[PDB]
Structure 1
Amino acid sequence: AYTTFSQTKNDQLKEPMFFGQPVNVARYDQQKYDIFEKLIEKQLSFFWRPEEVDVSRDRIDYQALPEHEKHIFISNLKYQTLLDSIQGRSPNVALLPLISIPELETWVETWAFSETIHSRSYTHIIRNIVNDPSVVFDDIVTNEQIQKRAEGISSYYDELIEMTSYWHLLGEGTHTVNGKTVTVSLRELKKKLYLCLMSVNALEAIRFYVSFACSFAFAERELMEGNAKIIRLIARDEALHLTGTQHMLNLLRSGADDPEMAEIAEECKQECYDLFVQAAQQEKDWADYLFRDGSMIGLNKDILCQYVEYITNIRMQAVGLDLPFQTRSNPIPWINTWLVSDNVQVAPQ
C-alpha cells in the first residue's frame, strides 16, 4: 500500500517522520521539523563537482609512495568508495518508502544525491592515480577486509527494506506465505528502522571520520593534496549527513514524534550501544590492516585507534548513548584544520 501520491488531504505538520501517510504534496513553505529544511538549504549551498579539483599532481605523489604507503592510501580510498556506493542508493531505497513528511523526504533525496557526487569524486581520484582502475574497483568487492564491513553495514539496510516490503504488501498481522508464518509487526519494523539509522550514524559520524584522518595525514605531509581538497568537500557534506541522522534518532527517542518509538528506543538501547562499540572495534581492526606493513609520519595504528575512541565517545554522546571509552583529548588536533567550514561546524565538538 505504498502510494506515490496518497489521496487523503492530510495535515503534514501532524504526521510522524516515519510510518505515517506517505507524502503527497511536496511543499516547502512550512515544516514539522525545520532542521531538515535547514540541512537541504545547506547541502544545496555546498553543491560542488569533483572535476572542480585538479588531482593531476596526485599521480606523481602516489607513484613516489613506498609500497606500504600506497597500501594505506589505496585501502582507505577503496573503503570510502565502498561506503558511499552504499550511501548513494541506500537512504533512498530504504527510507523513502517510510517517510511521511515532505521536508524529510526531500532531505533524504538530497542527501543520497550528494553521496553520488562523492562516489563520482572517488572515481575521479582513482582514474587519475592508477593505470588500471578496474583493479581497484574489483578489489572493493572481493577484498576480504572490505567485504566484512560491506556485509555488516548493508545488512541493516537490507533487513529494513525486506521488512518494509512485507509491511506494504501484507500490513500488520500474522500471515501465511507458501505455507510458512510471516509476522508483520509495526513495532518490529520501527525497531529495524531505529537500528539501521544508528548504524548509518556510526557510518557517517565515525567510520568516515576515521578515513578522513587517513586522507588528511597525507595532506599534512603535503602529499596527495588533490585528494585532500576533495575530502575537505566531502567532510563538509558528511557533517550535514550525520547531523541529519542525529536529529532523526533524537527526535524518535524523545517521544516527541512517535511516543511508541520512545519505548522502542529504550528497549533496544543496549543493542545500539553494542552496534556502536562493534563499529568502533571494526575501525580499530581496520587500522591494524592499514598499517600491517608499516606506518607513516604522523599516523600509525596506535594514533588512529586513539582517534577512533575519541570520536566514538563524542558521537555516542550526541545520540544519548553511554561512552564506551575512557575520556580523552583529540589525539590528532591537526585534523581540525581540514575539518572546518565557515557555514557548518565540520569538526566534532
Structure 2
Amino acid sequence: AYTTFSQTKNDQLKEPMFFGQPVNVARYDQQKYDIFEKLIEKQLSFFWRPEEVDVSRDRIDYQALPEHEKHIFISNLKYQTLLESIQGRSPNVALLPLISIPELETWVETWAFSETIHSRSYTHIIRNIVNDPSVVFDDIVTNEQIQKRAEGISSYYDELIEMTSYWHLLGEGTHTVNGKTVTVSLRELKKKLYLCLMSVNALEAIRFYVSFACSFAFAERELMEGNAKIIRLIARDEALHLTGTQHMLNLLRSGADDPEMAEIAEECKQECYDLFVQAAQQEKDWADYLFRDGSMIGLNKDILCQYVEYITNIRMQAVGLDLPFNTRSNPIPWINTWLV
C-alpha cells in the first residue's frame, strides 16, 4: 500500500509526522514543523568534503603511537565506522517509507546523506594511517567485542522494517500467511517506530559522543590532528541529528501531532528508560576491550564510565526521562574545547 506518489490531493500541514498519507509533492514554502526545514538549511550550510582534510601527519603520529594507544585509537575508529555505515542506510530504509510530511521526509534524506559523508571521512583516515584498510574493515564485521557494544541497533531497525513491510502489504488485522496467523497492528507498529527513534537518539546523542571523547583525547596530546578536524566536523553534524530526534520525540509526546503517539510515549516510557540504561551499560562494557592492553593518562575505564553517566543523564533529561545515574560534573571538561 506504499506509493512513490499518492494521487490524493492532501493538506500536508494536517498530516501527522508518521503513518499518514505518503508524501507527494516535495514543497518547501511551508511546513507543519519548521524546525525540520531549519535543520535541512543548517546541515546544508555545514557541507564539507572529507578528502579535503589533510591527514598526512596522522600516519606519522599513528605509527609513532605505543601499541596500546594504537589499539585504543583504532578500536574507537572501527566502532565509529560501524555505526556510521548503519546510519547511512537505516534512516532511509526504515523511516523514509513511513513519513507523511515533506519537511521531515527531506530532513531524513539529508541526514542520511551526511552520514555517508562521515563514512567516507573514515575511509579517508583509515586509508592514510594503515598499510591495508581491508584488515581494519574486515575486523569490523567479525570481532565480537565491537558487535557486542552495537548489539541491538541493526536488529531493531530490521524489525521495524519487517513490520512495516507487512503493514504496507497486508494492512491492519489478523492474517493467514503460509498457514500461520500473523497479526498486524498499527498501534504496535507505531510503538516500534517510537522506540526506534528513542534508540537512534541514544545512539547519536550518547554512543557517538563517547567515541568523540576517545578521539579528542589524542587531539589533546597534539596528535592525530587530521582525524581531530574530521571529528569536529562530524560532531557538528551529529548535534543537528540528535536535535532532530529530540524534536520528533518531544513533539510526539506533546499530543500536538498524532494523538495515539502521545498515548504510546506515556504508555511505554519505562521501555524508553530501559533502552538508555542498556545503551549506557554497553558503552561501559566496551571499556574492558578498549583498554585491554592498557590505558592512557587521562583516559581509562573510570573516566569513560563517569562520562557515560554524565552524558546519558543530560540526553535523557532532554527527552523528559528520569535520571538513572547520580548527578555529577563533567569528568572531562576539556572536551568542550573540541565541541561547539
Moved more, 138-147 or 285-294: 285-294
Q: Give the alignment's Cα RMSD to 1 decimal.
A: 0.7
**1:157 Cα deviation (Å)?**
0.6
**1:71 Cα deviation (Å)?**
0.6
Q: CA deviation digits over 1:16-41, x for unaligned, max 9?
A: 00000000000000000001000000
State the distance in 1 between where 2:26 and 2:149 align: 36
Q: Is the 8 A contact 2:277 2:324 kept in 1?
A: yes
Q: Is the 8 A contact 2:149 2:285 kept in 1?
A: no
Moved more, 306-315 or 283-292: 283-292
State the distance in 2 between where 1:67 and 1:215 align: 16
State the distance in 2 between where 1:7 and 1:149 align: 44
Matching residue of 2:57: 57
State, as a whole percentage, how many aligned pairs show the same letter. Answer: 99
State the distance in 1 between where 2:327 and 2:74 align: 32
Q: CA deviation digits over 1:180-216, x for unaligned, max 9?
A: 0110001000000011011100000000000000000
Q: For 1:222, what is the secondary structure of its paired residue?
A: coil
State the distance in 2 between where 1:283 and 1:93 align: 26
Q: CA deviation digits over 1:288-315, x for unaligned, max 9?
A: 2211221112211111111101000000
Moved more, 311-320 or 282-291: 282-291
**1:149 Cα deviation (Å)?**
3.3
Q: CA deviation digits over 1:114-161, x for unaligned, max 9?
A: 000000000000000000100000000001111123441111111100
State the distance in 2 between where 1:204 and 1:219 align: 21
Q: Is the 8 A contact 2:17 2:257 kept in 1?
A: yes
Moved more, 213-222 or 284-293: 284-293
Q: Which runs of 5+ in 2 are unaligned?
A: none
Matching residue of 2:308: 308
Q: For 1:182, what is the secondary structure of its paired residue?
A: strand
Q: How does 1:20-39 map to 2 (within 5 A)?
A: 20-39=20-39
Matching residue of 1:126: 126
Moved more, 150-159 or 31-40: 150-159
Q: CA deviation digits over 1:46-81, x for unaligned, max 9?
A: 000001210011111111111110110000000000
State the distance in 1 between where 2:161 and 2:150 align: 16
Q: Which runs of 5+ in 1 are unaligned?
A: 340-349
Q: For 2:138, what is the secondary structure of its paired residue?
A: helix
State the distance in 2 between where 1:146 and 1:278 align: 16
Q: CA deviation digits over 1:233-256, x for unaligned, max 9?
A: 000000000000000111111111
Q: For 1:14, what is the secondary structure of its paired residue?
A: coil
TM (normalized to structure 2)?
A: 0.99
Moved more, 142-151 or 131-140: 142-151
Q: For 2:9, what is the secondary structure of its paired residue?
A: coil
Q: Is the 8 A contact 2:149 2:283 kept in 1?
A: no
State the distance in 1 between where 2:37 and 2:124 align: 30
Q: Is the 8 A contact 2:149 2:286 kept in 1?
A: no
State the distance in 1 between where 2:109 and 2:233 align: 19
**1:42 Cα deviation (Å)?**
0.3
Matching residue of 1:279: 279
Q: For 1:226, what is the secondary structure of its paired residue?
A: helix
State the distance in 2 between where 1:185 and 1:244 align: 27
State the distance in 1 between where 2:42 and 2:286 align: 32
State the distance in 2 between where 1:155 and 1:208 align: 19
Q: Which 4+ stretches in 1 moved above 3 angstroms?
A: none
State the distance in 1 between where 2:9 and 2:213 align: 49
State the distance in 2 between where 1:116 and 1:165 align: 25
Q: Is the 8 A contact 2:50 2:117 kept in 1?
A: yes
State the distance in 2 between where 1:290 and 1:58 align: 20
Moved more, 305-314 or 283-292: 283-292
Moved more, 247-256 or 75-84: 247-256
Q: Is the 8 A contact 2:216 2:335 kept in 1?
A: yes
Q: For 2:121, what is the secondary structure of its paired residue?
A: helix
Q: CA deviation digits over 1:87-120, x for unaligned, max 9?
A: 0000000001000000000000000000000000
State the distance in 2 between where 1:254 and 1:194 align: 13
Matching residue of 1:343: none
**1:267 Cα deviation (Å)?**
1.4
TM (normalized to structure 1)?
A: 0.96
Q: How does 1:80-229 map to 2 (within 5 A)?
A: 80-229=80-229
Q: Is the 8 A contact 2:287 2:304 kept in 1?
A: yes
